[PDB]
Design a protein around this ligand. Structure first.
Ligand SMILES: *[C@@H]1O[C@H](CO)[C@@H](O)[C@H](O)[C@H]1NC(C)=O
Ligand SMILES: *[C@@H]1O[C@H](CO)[C@@H](O)[C@H](O)[C@H]1NC(C)=O
Ligand SMILES: *[C@@H]1O[C@H](CO)[C@@H](O)[C@H](O)[C@H]1NC(C)=O
Ligand SMILES: *[C@@H]1O[C@H](CO)[C@@H](O)[C@H](O)[C@H]1NC(C)=O
Ligand SMILES: *[C@@H]1O[C@H](CO)[C@@H](O)[C@H](O)[C@H]1NC(C)=O
Lengths: 337, 349, 340, 341, 345
């Protein structure tokens, strides 16, 4: 029998096959096994509260109408041209937590359609989906984002279509590096949600939850160090002789202006949320320290109009500012470790 | 008998059903009941005046040509591929700027046929709807963005839209917003737009959005609040220290110009004035007046027993200012924050 | 049967050919088009374009679509059946990009009258291009252009023209975020000419006038207040040299920064615009205040009878500068009132 | 008696037997295609991504003996644009392009015309963001020559040959203007005839000589930098005894122009060489830095006699030298970059 | 005889040729020799970790079903629309973010059929490929990007890719990059990805890129050097001017902090310290040490007592110790990143 004849008698308009009818019509729901193969990850834009992945979604199910005749026994599997993915039945599937997704088409469709002897069919597509995950920004430097990906079914209810994860190693990924986060392969915990939409019925949904732990290295080297230098400059302003009365205002005022610019820039860089953030706490603490330096200088200048009192105030303040700041910084780090 | 033959006999090629003719042709208009299911929300961009949704738009109608009796089952689900081969009611969103379907591993569509002839039709969508906003009091505003369903092909003489009796607009549990909070109340109206070609059915749903000042307070008001503290801490500096006082004024005014620019950078340009501009302008006028008061005092200490004794008068001026400016600012703070929140504004609720 | 009626009228059995215009090799078919603006806005000068959302409608008469089976004259047909009838070519010449609107169906309307007249209305979204003159930036009046034009057929076979009454409608409550759209809209024949032949073309003009509100609040007012601040030096005691040089310095700096920020939001144009003159002259005033301070400081350092001269120069300038600023400001508004 | 539909089926239709999959004069002389364009819109030249956008009414003409008819007395017969898919077309692609798309509004913006002898006119509206490298050695007064290349892709030179039209091949729409440049009336036309491993391919090239007006830049950063440097000179007349005034003058005049240079470079692409605006700004920065340095030297001299007289002497020397140095530098810089190089 | 009938007899409906089945079914795998011709290269942005190419991808595979003898000529050119009626090899780029075809007045595809059955298929694409970056020494880096060709529909048991032996990768004459220098040696290796479903063929081509200092040396390094010289020039001002000298130290830290914020603005967020980052951070210590020295000098002078002599001594000691420190440290930083500890392949 020619391969053309086998394909025609298996799934063609010339054979009694209806792609519009699911296998086991009006009977047992069609069990579907799904496993994902991550390929590309990243571009986690906190501003838009979303991230972009690139996966090889593979789904395999059962279909008694596709049985390879025992006339020929070439192999257990049988590869078929991808263009016949549109000639046989497929399971309705979509990502509920998805914003903008698309196929890929370069020199050919990126689809593989294995067919086994017993009737099981393996199908895999290459997808580039842009999932959105609600980020929590309560503790920005040491946050742990929890971005998930939940599949679903649309046309068929749980009485016809049901999704089951792979028995072993359902999600795979090979040496993916990230610029900001550290995906943990072992921590790939995943359950299922069985979404229930009122007015239509049940709908199966199997989900994957990725655990991401942002590294604070970039922020530590870039943002916190200039704040530390500004604080040290504010401290160094103390030792200046108060007799000048005009060589100590510029240091403090320019330090507070620099802090204002830094907080404005950081607010612009970050998505707009209502709640407070640890980075905002650091910025407001630094600005409050600058304000305290300014008011201490004002108090010293007022007391200068007495020199012994001014010297005592300067010594006491220079003794209490750095140790108090260090205690505050240590407790802040301990709280947000 | 066979399911393939059943589908062919019901509405397939052998059936003779025509998808180019509306049901109940030359008769009563085919009423359509629609109810949506919001799945996501947000990205309300003030600059471009639009917001994005992700709805599971649904529809229901009747047609005697789809009545079946062979299968005792009532709620029969069908492949979305078949869905293009039956008559569907025209529908579009009037106040939209861009929308698209979702095609991932299939078309995200649903088709359901009931025994009595009713048809269910739920299609996933993604709308970048447009809603003009009023920013008279921007930091503490309330917005009413709309989603306006409307027909385009058939007139109201052939198609009528109406909401479901119970739970017309449903919101998926756990939904939140980045900048606002969605009020549970959603008003429903009839818009029934009129054109020069006929009377067109139209259905409008109201969304009430309220803006929380969590970000805006701590990002604009508090820093601008502390800048004016910095502005009046000069009044305790002696007049003698002239450069200190003058520098303390000018840096404070400059930073407030920069902050006003940064604040207005995030909104579309509007001819009318907003709350944030009023606050910024008044609080900046305060530091400007502080610097000018310095100038007046310095002039007084610069020749306005035959002694000048203008030092005492300058000290009196400084003492009066140090007790007036913080007090005046406090009464302004109370008056503004009450007048833009209680009596004549924020009554839109 | 309605299906049989559609088949006999212009269906497969009819024999109607959709590739041949009505009155083939005869008089040109006159097409009357009127539009309906639904949403108008997104007018950006950075890319020099604006976005509309029109319910474009067309009307034409063809003798091959005459029916007598149905007593009713006005018949509505499925939009998906529009591919089987002749449709006049129509492209917007000054378009940077356009797209249909497909949501749950094609957004089209078809209507066939008993006499054979056909109404065809399609929703669109056009990002047209309109050049602008920025001679008077805050008080300009731009006329952005919508141009309808035929492409496939020459003037010998297709002629466009507006309706007799109510050619352009604007939806009630429509407003511009930036400008103030006038009710008056010019309707002129366009009639472009090319080397291939003569192509019909239809023009409608929108008069757009800018509102000075945002600009007056955000860009003129800070400049006026800052140049007022530059005058605070003249009342300071001459003893404080650093105090006066400082305010002059920071005023010059901040006005330069304001100039950069103001021009950061406009397209690069060779000619000077209206706003730049005001800001440049105010910056020149601040610079001249600093220069006059420097001259008075030179005079002070040459009871040498120089205190009288220094104070005379300072006092004379403290009154000459407000007069100069007032007269320039009045003149700058007056010249722009002369232009408009 | 001959219905137009029957004639169309007889000439290009299914009944005709015309095959759209075979080029005219198969196994014969190469098919020549005289093509001419008509620019409708021009502009959006961005240096950061190094490209520009055009809106051309591309036209092509060729001879095909299988489309010869004598039934209709009229010679120039126009057809529905949908008829294009049933007849042969010449392959074409713009080699130096980054993104292309047709224009579909209420129909396809294509025009088909067929003459009596078989000559076919086919004009299609396009929109191209062509890529053209720029030489930014003298950026404020550069002269760029962006290129549009037309080339066959499928058929080789042995089968398809592209030639410009004899007269007036490239036109410009009346009133066409650019916000930053001037489009010259002259437009060079030359061949390129690129070849690869597959074989020789026909090619067509047109040159748009573009020149820049310094109108925007002269008022945006040339004048402000000059005013800032003029500000830096006012320190000379300030008394040498008073330090903070001259210190602030020098410091702020140095500081305010580094941000000017950063802003100027922000809108320009990263380049290895040095641009003219960069040279001007660097020279002004050196001038203001030397203005601060000379004050530092004066302050050193005063603070170690009668050295105050020497401090006044050096201050006067600086005051009489810096304007001369800036004037000679300006007349040197505005001559070579403007006329010579 | 008739060319249309010849095409129909070769691959048309009357031919019986099947496009759904690969050639030599249930036999040896089909060898596909491919080569690419780069047309446009650029848009290598470090922020999005991506770059854009413009290639004339070509492929050459042998099938026996496309053998003809009617036409004496061996090499024949066909209409690009015939490509849908013949079998094609599946080929997708693994390390890509977004790609598209190119159609203008027709598809940009070439089809050539030789007499012996060899087929030459070439299509014009545009790939926004993704390649990892290394920013340990950001201004002096040698960044290599990858272009992977891998089959998807068939395993290696059926489809096998391999480069052409002679002239595998070409570049158009006059090709240049705005900020990089593409090397002339291009490496060819084998990836041969192995998934759980099967073992699939994969061909990889390496690209070598080296960054130049031209933009950075004149926009980034020099302004910081002149800022440090500005903070330097303080030592020569008279020490009695308490607000004057300190102003330079006040302003230098502010402007250099702003410059540092702008320096990393257009760079991706990276944990490791970049070469520009370490250079400017260590330059921050010098401008801050200038203010530290002034603070120490002022404290010494502000408590006859020969303290002015010590103040001038520390002033000249700083003015003589900063030169050696900067001149040695900056040159060490240059040499270590150039040859000693980094770069050099
Ligand atoms: C899905 O969740 C439902 C909850 O009722 C459970 O019965 C079912 O076993 C789950 N299936 C999978 C594959 O997790
Ligand atoms: C549909 O609803 C409309 C509006 O209430 C009503 O007039 C009509 O009778 C209803 N039913 C049918 C079959 O048209
Ligand atoms: C179209 O209008 C022109 C106006 O001159 C007229 O000559 C022609 O007959 C008209 N054609 C029609 C009504 O079909
Ligand atoms: C077409 O033009 C080419 C040169 O462009 C010429 O060699 C050839 O003879 C012309 N005619 C034909 C029929 O090939
Ligand atoms: C393909 O090449 C392999 C070796 O790589 C060889 O074994 C096989 O026979 C070849 N198949 C052909 C030439 O059809």
């Amino acid at each position: 029998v020619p391969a053309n004849s086998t394909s025609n008698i298996l799934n063609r308009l010339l054979v009694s096959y209806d792609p519009r009818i699911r296998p086991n019509f009006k009977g047992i729901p069609v069990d579907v096994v799904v496993n994902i193969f991550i390929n590309s990850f990243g571009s986690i834009q906190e501003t838009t509260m979303d991230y972009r992945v690139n996966i090889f979604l593979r789904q395999k199910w059962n279909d008694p109408r596709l049985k390879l005749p025992s006339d020929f026994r070439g192999s257990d599997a049988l590869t078929v041209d991808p263009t016949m993915y549109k000639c046989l039945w497929k399971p309705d599937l979509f990502f509920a937590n998805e914003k903008s997704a698309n196929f890929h088409d370069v020199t050919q469709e990126n689809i593989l359609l294995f067919i086994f002897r017993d009737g099981d069919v393996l199908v895999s597509m290459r997808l580039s989906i842009t999932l959105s995950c609600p980020l929590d920004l309560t503790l920005f430097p040491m946050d742990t984002q929890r971005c998930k990906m939940q599949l679903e079914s649309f046309g068929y209810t749980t009485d016809d279509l049901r999704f089951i994860w792979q028995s072993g190693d359902p999600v795979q990924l090979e040496k993916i590096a990230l610029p900001q986060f550290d995906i943990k392969k072992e921590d790939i915990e995943y359950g299922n949600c069985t979404k229930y939409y009122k007015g239509t019925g049940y709908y199966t949904c199997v989900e994957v939850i990725f655990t991401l732990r942002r590294q604070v290295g970039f922020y530590m080297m870039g943002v916190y160090a200039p704040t530390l230098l500004i604080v040290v400059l504010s401290w160094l302003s103390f030792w200046i002789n108060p007799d000048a009365s005009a060589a100590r205002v510029p240091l403090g005022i320019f330090s507070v202006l620099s802090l204002a610019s830094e907080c404005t820039t950081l607010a612009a860089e970050l998505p707009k949320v209502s709640y407070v953030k640890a980075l905002d706490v650091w910025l407001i603490a630094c600005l409050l320290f600058g304000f305290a330096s300014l008011v201490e200088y004002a108090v010293v200048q007022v007391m200068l109009n007495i020199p012994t009192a001014a010297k005592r105030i300067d010594l006491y303040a220079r003794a209490l500012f750095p140790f108090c700041f260090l205690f505050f910084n240590v407790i802040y780090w301990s709280i947000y470790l | 008998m066979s399911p393939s033959d059943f589908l062919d006999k019901l509405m397939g090629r052998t059936s003779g059903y025509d998808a180019r003719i509306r049901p109940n042709f030359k008769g009563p208009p085919v009423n359509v009941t629609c109810n949506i299911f919001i799945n996501s929300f947000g990205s309300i961009a003030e600059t471009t005046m639009d917001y994005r949704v992700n709805i599971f738009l649904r529809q229901k109608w009747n047609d005697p040509r789809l009545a079946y009796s062979e299968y005792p089952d009532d709620s029969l689900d069908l492949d979305p591929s078949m869905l293009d081969s039956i008559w569907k009611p025209d529908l579009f969103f009037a106040n939209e700027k861009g929308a698209n379907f979702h095609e991932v591993t299939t078309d995200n569509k649903l088709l359901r046929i009931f025994k009595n002839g009713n048809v269910l039709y739920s299609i996933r969508l993604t709308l970048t709807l447009s809603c003009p906003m009023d920013l008279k009091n921007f930091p503490m505003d309330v917005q009413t963005c709309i989603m306006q369903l409307e027909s385009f092909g058939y007139t109201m003489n052939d198609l009528i839209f109406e909401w479901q009796d119970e739970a017309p607009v449903q919101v998926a549990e756990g939904l939140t917003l980045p900048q606002f909070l969605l009020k549970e109340e959603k008003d429903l109206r009839y818009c029934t737009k009129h054109y020069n070609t006929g009377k067109f059915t139209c259905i409008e749903v109201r969304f009430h959005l309220e803006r929380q000042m969590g970000y805006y307070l701590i990002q604009m008001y508090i820093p601008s609040l502390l800048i004016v503290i910095l502005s009046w801490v000069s009044f305790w500096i002696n007049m003698d220290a002239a450069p200190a006082r003058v520098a303390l004024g000018i840096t404070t005014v400059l930073t407030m110009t920069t902050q006003s620019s940064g604040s207005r950078a995030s909104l579309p340009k509007v001819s009318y004035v907003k709350a944030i501009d009023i606050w910024m302008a008044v609080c900046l006028l305060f530091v400007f007046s502080a610097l000018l008061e310095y100038a007046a005092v310095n002039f007084v200490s610069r020749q306005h027993e035959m002694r000048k004794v203008f030092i005492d008068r300058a000290k009196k001026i400084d003492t009066i200012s140090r007790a007036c400016f913080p007090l005046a600012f406090l009464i302004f703070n109370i008056f503004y924050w009450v007048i833009y929140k209680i009596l004549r504004h924020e009554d839109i609720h």
